[PDB]
Amino acid sequence: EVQLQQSGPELEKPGASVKISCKASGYSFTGYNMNWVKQSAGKRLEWIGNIDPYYGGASYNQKFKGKATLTVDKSSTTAYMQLQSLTSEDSAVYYCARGGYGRYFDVWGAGTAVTVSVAKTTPPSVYPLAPGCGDTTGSSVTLGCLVKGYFPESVTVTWNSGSLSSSVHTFPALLQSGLYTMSSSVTVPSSTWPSQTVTCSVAHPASSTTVDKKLEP
Amino acid sequence: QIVLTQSPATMSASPGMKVTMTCSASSSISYMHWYQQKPGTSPKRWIYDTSKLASGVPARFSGSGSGTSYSLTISNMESEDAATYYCHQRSRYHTFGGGTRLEIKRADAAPTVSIFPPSSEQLTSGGASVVCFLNNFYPKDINVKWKIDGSERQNGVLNSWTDQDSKDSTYSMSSTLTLTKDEYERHNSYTCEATHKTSTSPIVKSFNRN
């Protein structure tokens, strides 16, 4: 059936450019306009522009004039979007979407992540989060690991090799000054920590890093 | 040009309930389109040309509206309907609404608040993050204030929220105050203070270095 296959995640430095693609299949390519949509993390959809593959005309959201350039390639029935002079504002997921009759978007690509950072691949610093002296006043104790200063996404954080999952929270990473920070929490009965050992295992595939950190009282 | 407004941005409902969400336009439009989106997925065409259902959309969904006011309704909500819904119109331009996320309704629940001093490992690096977890609360609205020696501290704070939990429908949040090691060591008392509708008093969670 009809599919739009988008290119993989992009990582680029401020001021650079990126060109992402959207390969269409299953239909007469020139019969539908192709639209591009931006979505910043946890935010709304924003229309960037569209292109008519038959006559080649492109129309732009005025905000993206000078930022986005749309083209098509009929040798590969692919739609392209180039983003120039990248800034942190450009880190987002970008969707291509097929328009019908200039009205609705009936087929969407999977989206392409673009992340802008001056950082190269960088392994995380992994810090234990243990309560201060005297803090554990009741029946539970919450522990955590702070996973800081890594690039790019993603990391996984596992507690006691996955045995403690039902009380675990994984907090979405935040990008600051080109590096990511995330945290994870776990709660166990206070009668089991620190009398027993709790370890967070942090994996960061991009840097080939695995860190096991024991939580100390 | 035409501005689409979706309010509320978050809507609560329980399985079985009728649900109606609204999208209003700054000027009259001819059709409204709606997309459903879930975390990690692309938007999907859901309702188009105001009232037409895309293939594979359950009949419990319907669309209506005219002029400057349009709506998407679920006759009897299912759990799988919890998602974000975006309206979309085209006149001179394609424009989108800000989205309405339908969440699963549950009873209120006060957060469990935990605070953590900087680890010795971090301190050896010249840095100092103080971390507060506020876990398993409902509804999602919550305010966290950091205080250092009783005085509110606003710069250097970063906050992260989880998505609504699959199993208990609550929310959780992490808040981190990052200082230099020298600034951290200059003060004794660190406080994570939270306000949530489950109590008229702020939840105070502190540690004293001495």
Numbering used by the authors:
A (entry chain A): 1 to 52, 52A, 53 to 72, 72A, 72B, 72C, 73 to 100, 100A, ...
B (entry chain B): 1 to 29, 31 to 94, 96 to 212
From the paper:
HHV-6B's unique gH/gL/gQ1/gQ2 complex (a tetramer expressed on the viral envelope) recognizes the cellular receptor, i.e., human CD134 (hCD134), which is essential for the entry of the virus into the host's cells.
The Fab domain of anti-gQ1 Mab KH-1 presented a positively charged area at the cleft between the heavy chain and light chain, including a total of eight positively charged residues (blue). The other notable feature was the seven tyrosine residues located along the cleft (brown). The amount of hCD134-hFcHis bound on the tetramer was decreased as the concentration of anti-gQ1 Mab KH-1 increased, indicating that anti-gQ1 Mab KH-1 competed with hCD134-hFcHis for binding to the tetramer. The single-particle analysis of the tetramer/anti-gQ1 Mab KH-1 Fab complex clearly unveiled extra density at one end of the elongated shape in the 2D averages, and this was also apparent in the reconstituted 3D density with 51,607 particles at 17.6 Å resolution, further extending the elongated long axis of the tetramer. The size and shape of the extra density at the tip of the Palm area was consistent with that of the Fab, and the crystal structure shown in Fig 3A could be well-fitted. Because the gQ1 itself is responsible for recognition of the hCD134, the simplest explanation is that the binding of anti-gQ1 Mab KH-1 resulted in a sequestration of the hCD134 direct binding site on the tetramer, thereby preventing the viral entry. Our EM analysis of the tetramer and anti-gQ1 Mab KH-1 complex revealed that the binding site was located on the expected membrane-distal end of the tetramer, further extending the elongated shape. It is noteworthy that the tetramer has a critical residue (Glu127) in the gQ1 for the binding to hCD134, and the Lys79 residue in hCD134 is indispensable for the interaction, implying a contribution of electrostatic interaction.
